């Protein structure tokens, strides 16, 4: 099994839409292994970029083909390098960029705390004619750096498992696992736009609603309700395009339905009263 | 003809948009057949990834073109495998990503029961050529899972058939029949974001509509029931965007016209009595 | 002159955008032609798939390129089959999709009949060169069936002509005439939707606006009647993206002007009034 | 130098966003040039299409690479062919797409005088060492005909002009002046739409906003003016989404705040009355 | 080191999406070197254009891939020149449209003074084989244009750096700096259109709430401040569309925030009157 060195550097995690709950890297992938002993032109290494290496491919050179598991879409690769040393190393480098997706659950949505994660793995190769050695992930470029509205907090998280597959069994009966590389960057979101623009004026709302209570009528007291009513719904118009169709209710969503059972509590209140 | 062993393994299911009535569906792709015996180098089977194919199939290998006949657009497809054995069998491994489409009705909108269906079918080649033997659906990512807003119910049914196509009848007679390959999925709606954000606010604004007969006036009672209109208005603003234009009614369309004909009865009665 | 037979077969016709006024068209086409006598391995006629299609070319086999005249960017082509028969037939089949654009005119928008129109061309020979024999359309798959918000009523019009291009004729002194294929599939708007989403409630609205002379007031009076302005406005919102932006006025059109000017035409009522 | 002879047919222009200042034309273009003379087979000219003309380029044909200079993005080039005649004459005929900018001010808004401009220059060739003769353009599918909002008036305008390129002058100092085509197309936008849509309505509401001044109140006149100070905001809700944002003000923006400054006016006025 | 010398031509920057923080830059790139002497077919220089220059990096020429570090996705690439020349030197000539990001902070939102910044670096070719000699930045096309809503001051700044990239250190221990070319724009937002579009109608809507303490009443007035409210909640709409989700709070946010105080402020004063 031939042993492969992954370096993973993130460039910048950007486009993070929570509706989608997919999020785009961009960065460079720096795979290495030994094979066979190469008289290179030269005591120098060779290097082959985009294109040329097909040919190389051609003529038997072995490269793995190294896959996201949770990308959405073909990456976006852009250039490749393959770096040939007289001894037999070879270094692959390549730029890639993919929607990747995560679990993401929104339990505490304005404090998310959610974590992105990049899985890596052979397409063809497993564990028994490709092992993965090791991985040092390099996000110093967003190491503590206020991404769109997402704090990233601490360094990233490295880990190298197998993978059985039960659909490759019945093909493959005994050599069916495969090295997997799973990359997490734990990110918390920035609650202050969401502090300033829902929270509190939906505090405002539902303090307004309180004061209905000190009118001596009936009539526009129930227009005033109702004008409320209209307020809240208008909230309720710009909730839905900030977070997905959740089945569980989230900060907003609670305090959209506590302004709503305020009017209408009000609403029986008055309809008690007369 | 070549007896083909299909086994799809569903990765994930994503991006149900009910608007285009189309979904997601990412995996890969299992075919597997005998072919003529040929002398590998080595006696371990050899495998050819991406690119490296198109030499094999320049060279006259016979590696059949599936399809998906309810695609919409062509699919992503991602890194592609072939490994051959020195015995003849033949492995094709492939990863796809593409649209689907389906029926898809919407009488019970809130409480879907929709089907996904994947068609798999050789381009070319006919039952006389190539005959599907088995399929074996993996769906263990997704077996019980709650992906977007749809709960997977069990797991995958399978089914082979054979296809007559009329449009191939005039330039093939007698041989215009095609092995097609159906999927199904059974996937359930989660109806409790639109529980908690259509219905009880609309039978709030019910229990208010009826709460306009309370007043003894009539000139601002109309000026409520007109609040009340463009209340009710506000809330099909944001009513289409979340099911497609059908001819028929659902739920959420009947609370809508419910509340309408309510605030114009509520017009009616009041014109009425005066 | 090469003569060509053309059987266009629609899979599916989708994605009508009324505002942008395109619509997708999926399916296969099937040209057959006879050409030289080849020597094919085997006295079965020999199957070329995708790609391998090429290599045929470079040797010097004559495939024409047809076009679609009326197609919105490049059509999303998927696989090519093209089929060889020792006496010398050539079948050429391949699956097609792309956006198509028709006239599309909307003066009873409600209550649509518009012609989806696919134009096909070769686009380097002429009916000196090439000339289309026959074409016959299988619309089987939606023949009766109600797609989208339209439905399709009876078969398909098929149409061979010749078109004379001026801008070939600098070039091509006395042979710039083209043989063009022009395919009519009939489709008639479902109105259900339209009818009870707007023309129901605006007539609530014109109702409601009729209601307002019944007021001993003058005040709150005019309140109402700006009520039912921003009522009107409300129902103008979600009207302008359901069709495009048109010199003429629709149905949907129409009601709203109604509604304005009798909204208006309430206020210039109780001025002159009082 | 050779001379190149283009003749650009426009077959249609549509998709014209008024807020990314964008349309997208297609078309085909038919440049002509006379060569080395060659020994076709046969003496009548032979026809290449798509992807046999590379062929024809690794044996050392000369094609030139015209590009479109306000182009936004690749070009969706289609079909291309290349008509090789035995005396000499290279005829190149190819189907471009793509989506070109002009400057497109809109100081009248709903009575716009546009140009849709088309620039063609080769990239590599400057005029001493390839020069366009003369153009031809042929917009007689669109010559008068109501294409999405737009009136095309006359025929098109061709110019020939020589561009001096300073950042090329440092690696080619003598000869950096390139042979350019200017293909203007006068459109004039039909303003019948937004003249039901837009301006009638807010004439209306200047018309209400005048009517304020016969209440004897002060209370319910307020309301009634802020109830007007919301029906404007509705109206400049959809003013932003059909022109661009512009450092002037258009036709439509100057009505919206002529009913601002006729509302707060009127505030102003009861304020001081009071 | 081959010494390379830039010249990078903008033709246009437009598309700056201020909620992606990203935008689009078209122009062409002039890269010029001296390499090995060669004899061309002729005295004359030979000009390769695209495709054709493969076969001669198949054949063993040196041409570097200039990737761009900030594009987002892969550029879209146009035409391609590679101009040899006998002596030696090698201009190579590219078209480039991508989308560009920078840091893009928004303090002062209608009066945003940001720099587009666009860096260029070869992909594998460190200092030690590949210096930057020089670039001249012609953004003569723009120098002094309202592009957008944006406008360009001054010249363009060059700069040119090493880079050291620790992800390269693991496998290139000695030699991973790289040389990396900026190119800053320096851009002034025109602010003429948020001016007579936010703040002066949100400057008239703190004035009207100022305004509500002239009635001798304690219903309607809270009826005429919850109607402000809903006016208040109204400019909120299309108030997050026009710049991206910031921690922090701009100019038009205070003003939003601002009129919710004010309007909440006037209903804690009145009640406490009561």
Sequence with gaps: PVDVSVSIFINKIYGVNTLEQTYKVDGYIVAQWTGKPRKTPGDKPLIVENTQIERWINNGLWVPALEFINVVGSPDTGNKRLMLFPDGRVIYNARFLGSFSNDMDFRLFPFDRQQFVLELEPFSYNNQQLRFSDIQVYTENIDNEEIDEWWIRGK?????????????????????????????????????????????????????????????????????????????????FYTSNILPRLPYTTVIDQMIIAGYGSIFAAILLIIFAH
Tied chains: 1, 2, 3, 4, 5.
């Design 156 to 236: 990233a998280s490295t880990h190298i498992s197998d993978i059985r597959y039960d659909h490759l069994s019945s093909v493959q009966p005994n050599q069916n696992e495969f090295s997997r590389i799973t990359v997490r960057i734990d990110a918390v979101r920035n609650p202050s736009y969401y502090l300033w623009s829902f929270i509190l004026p939906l505090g405002l709302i539902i303090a307004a609603s309180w004061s209905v209570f000190w009118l001596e009528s009936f009539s526009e007291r129930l227009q005033t309700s109702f004008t409320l009513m209209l307020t809240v719904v208008a909230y309720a």
